[PDB]
Design a binder for this molecule. Sequence first.
Ligand SMILES: [Cl-]
Ligand SMILES: [Cl-]
Ligand SMILES: [Cl-]
Ligand SMILES: [Cl-]
Ligand SMILES: [Cl-]
Ligand SMILES: [Cl-]
Ligand SMILES: [Cl-]
Ligand SMILES: [Cl-]
Ligand SMILES: [Cl-]
Ligand SMILES: [Cl-]
Ligand SMILES: [Cl-]
Ligand SMILES: [Cl-]
Ligand SMILES: [Cl-]
Ligand SMILES: [Cl-]
Ligand SMILES: [Cl-]
Lengths: 205, 209, 211, 205
Amino acid sequence: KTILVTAFDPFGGEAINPSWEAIKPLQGSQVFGANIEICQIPCIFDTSLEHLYAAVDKYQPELVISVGQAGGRTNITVERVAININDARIPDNAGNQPIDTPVIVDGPAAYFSRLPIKTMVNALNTAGIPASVSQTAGTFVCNHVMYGLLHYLAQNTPSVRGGFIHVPYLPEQAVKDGNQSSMTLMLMTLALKIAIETAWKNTSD
Amino acid sequence: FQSMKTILVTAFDPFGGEAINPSWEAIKPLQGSQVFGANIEICQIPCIFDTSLEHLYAAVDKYQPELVISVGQAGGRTNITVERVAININDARIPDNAGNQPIDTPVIVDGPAAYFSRLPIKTMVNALNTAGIPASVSQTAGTFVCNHVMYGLLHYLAQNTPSVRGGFIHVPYLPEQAVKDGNQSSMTLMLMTLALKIAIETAWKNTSD
Amino acid sequence: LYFQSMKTILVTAFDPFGGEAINPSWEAIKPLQGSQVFGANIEICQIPCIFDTSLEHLYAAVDKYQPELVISVGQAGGRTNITVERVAININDARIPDNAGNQPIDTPVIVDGPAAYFSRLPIKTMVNALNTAGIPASVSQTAGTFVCNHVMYGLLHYLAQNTPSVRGGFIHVPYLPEQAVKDGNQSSMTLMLMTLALKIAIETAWKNTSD
Amino acid sequence: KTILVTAFDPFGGEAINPSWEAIKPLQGSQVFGANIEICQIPCIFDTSLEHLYAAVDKYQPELVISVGQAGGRTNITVERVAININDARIPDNAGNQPIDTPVIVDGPAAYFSRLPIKTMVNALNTAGIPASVSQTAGTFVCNHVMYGLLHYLAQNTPSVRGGFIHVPYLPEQAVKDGNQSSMTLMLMTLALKIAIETAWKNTSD
Ligand SMILES: [Cl-]
Ligand SMILES: [Cl-]
Ligand SMILES: [Cl-]
Ligand SMILES: [Cl-]
Ligand SMILES: [Cl-]
Ligand SMILES: [Cl-]
Ligand SMILES: [Cl-]
Ligand SMILES: [Cl-]
Ligand SMILES: [Cl-]
Ligand SMILES: [Cl-]
Ligand SMILES: [Cl-]
Ligand SMILES: [Cl-]
Ligand SMILES: [Cl-]
Ligand SMILES: [Cl-]
Ligand SMILES: [Cl-]
């Protein structure tokens, strides 16, 4: 049994992406009889989704957790819902900047996360790690991937649960001095380990 | 041959009902360090107006440090902050650990309005940033026991041992402290301790900005 | 030919909630009562801050006034500006109880309704009209999970099922200065600025069919 | 009996300064047996203080209140203390960007405001206007002026009380979509009116 965990390459002028750095130590790890496979996907509209679909079809996971950077957030956030819209504040890594276009034409307006998000947030908080449910994953490539994931799973393999977790800046990214919050890499990896284990052990909230 | 010198690092007891103060937890691993020609000595100060200062004076007299760095917690701040200035006022929003809640009283009667930190604060902030640790200069240490101690420290050194440099550093909440409702930033204990190591070493090795 | 009925814009706001004695959403739209713009008369309606009951009152108002445009207003304490909502989501998750003591946890607004409805208002044009008037405003991607989002969802669903040509959406106002006096560094906007902003937003929505 | 109120001209890239806009309607109004006189001073280190020095020597005020813009603040703030340092994040209006230089060479490290700051904040809050005491007026031209003012009065006319009030952005300045707080001009002017009258009527705190 496989858990697929995805993250992104650096974007928006950054030299690092905490989502990828944080999941690297999880590769090959066992989660109660499931093993973790990681995959890096490009921060590019549509191309990102092609990488995602290819990874899902290759690994045939029972659980998919996609991870992204949410610079400025203070804590770990587990996303409640993905919406069917691209509205890019900045260009992606290939220079695309879609304004109010659908992620999937004629797809539904939204998909709820299929992860046990409350249980995950409570496990994190109980472990002394600040975490909360988020009601918006943005309208950039992270939400795009969350929506595409949930749509793909619903259309092909409905018993497979997918969802999204955002991590904050690493300290090295918050040095730029706009009074930005951070979380160490060590703490991020621990938080993701707990969140993934919790999602695996608990089918629903 | 030459004498080892002494760096005194202080931190506080927990306050406002908390069970821990990360300022103390962060400096505990530094006790007994013999590094770059200096013995590091630490001391826990009660979070009580005036009594804190008596403990501070006793520690300075005991260790006869060539450098003093006092540490406190500033829950809500996003990074490590190095204080520019201590002001001669107490104005407590909550009571201290002895129940005192002074409103607009001097730290030292007829002392000057303020003391600038004598630490190389820009150099320290730059050393932290360069090491990948978020940090900034702060223009206010608050009006609670932390500012009280910063002021009392700088006044005591000025009056008694002017060549000794003192100052103050604030750490943010620990992650476990930020779990409560609210959008509060945090920094791990491990990162705090690393940041304090860098700050102390930089302060010791740089006489001015 | 003669006595051609004017079109109608329905603007709703809420009762006070959360222990407040005032709701600026209602205070801000009161001056719009008995007004008209570009061939449409404005009708206002105050709805209870109660899950499900709020929706009952909304449906009754819509049926009564047969509006061609519906804009619902609520307070989002802590926001810095005027926000125009992009999307309503099919969930109730109450941080605090409503005015009747209900505190639903992760229940649908409408059972077996879609997961979301996008606002049908020209939200970018409304935001730009506010900004160019000198009034801070932004598009929001979340109306929360309390009664405001609940009403936005129910409105969009009701219109979709019954009168699909009718456009609806939601606008949040921040705290009034008096509400922000409590400790905690809260942002605010005066009632006068809120009323001006809603006037501009409503006029822009009525005159622009799309973004 | 003249109450003196000062404000600044636009700085940074700004087109307007709320401090000046807010105090204009206050010109010539009486406050319990005193007149208000206003003066605009340039946002330039040292040059600012000369204009200030001239104005105090001209109207011979029993009360001086200087006002400035604190973009980002959510409320009206009354400054507790001025410090003897210039440390400019951006150049002033003449291109000067001093780094850690004294406001007055060999002046004391700081001067406390001589205004009844707690009474002023209480009066504002009671009027339904968010306000607080601030412990830092920055290290730009506003603090520079506050310090130079308090030094001047202490050296020449110790019975004359001086201090500083910061106003937030006007709404039109917060349009930039950087999530900035604001206060309308109407509210600022009322706040300043109340704060000034409170300062006048209450000699202590
Ligand atoms: Cl975006
Ligand atoms: Cl819950
Ligand atoms: Cl976004
Ligand atoms: Cl942040
Ligand atoms: Cl790290
Ligand atoms: Cl604290
Ligand atoms: Cl305090
Ligand atoms: Cl500061
Ligand atoms: Cl920790
Ligand atoms: Cl750690
Ligand atoms: Cl009703
Ligand atoms: Cl108002
Ligand atoms: Cl500055
Ligand atoms: Cl500044
Ligand atoms: Cl205005």
